[PDB]
Amino acid sequence: NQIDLNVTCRYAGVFHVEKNGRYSISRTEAADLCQAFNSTLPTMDQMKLALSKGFETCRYGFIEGNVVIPRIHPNAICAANHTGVYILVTSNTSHYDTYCFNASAPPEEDCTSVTDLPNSFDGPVTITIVNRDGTRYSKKGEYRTHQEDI
Numbered sequence: 825n826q827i828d829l830n831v832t833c834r835y836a837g838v839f840h841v842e843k844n845g846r847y848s849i850s851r852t853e854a855a856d857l858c859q860a861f862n863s864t865l866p867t868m869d870q871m872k873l874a875l876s877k878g879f880e881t882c883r884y885g886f887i888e889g890n891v892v893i894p895r896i897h898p899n900a901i902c903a904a905n906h907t908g909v910y911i912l913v914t915s916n917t918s919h920y921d922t923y924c925f926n927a928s929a930p931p932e933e934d935c936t937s938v939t940d941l942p943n944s945f946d947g948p949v950t951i952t953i954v955n956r957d958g959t960r961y962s963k964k965g966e967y968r969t970h971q972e973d974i
């Protein structure tokens with residue numbers, strides 16, 4: 825009973841979270857997951873400011889109201905070579921990664937590791953935060969409040 829959560833640097837408080845190395849988060853699970861990090865789904869304005877500070881990924885993830893990919897450098901296999909906050913328009917499917925926004929984070933690039941999941945609740949799952957540099961933090965708990973996500 826284990827969940828891996830791969831996380832990134834924070835840029836103006838915004839970061840990316842991928843669950844179990846696959847697109848596997850529903851919109852309801854995404855909001856609950858950000859709440860476990862004392863965070864919220866970013867607004868489009870919050871995401872645009874993060875992009876301006878150096879944030880980019882090559883993965884679709886929820887923000888408030890849309891599924892997006894922030895892009896700085898054009899790459900043919902990431903958001904069809906677009907730059908800016910690329911918005912997913914047409915998809916059959918509902919599960920993505922998520923972005924999260926922590927208002928208490930530094931204002932610009934914070935590429936220190938994440939060493940806590942401060943607002944997880946009591947539960948039976950071994951949850952492991954995996955940083956890009958491989959460093960890990962694990963704790964037993966739960967974050968999902970909707971049954972259809974478990």
Ligand SMILES: Cc1n[nH]c(C)c1CNC1CCCCC1
Pocket residue numbers: 834839861862863926929936937938939940941942
């Ligand atoms: C700076 C830092 N490293 N690990 C932890 C925990 C913290 C405090 N802020 C984090 C920021 C991203 C969401 C979770 C909370």
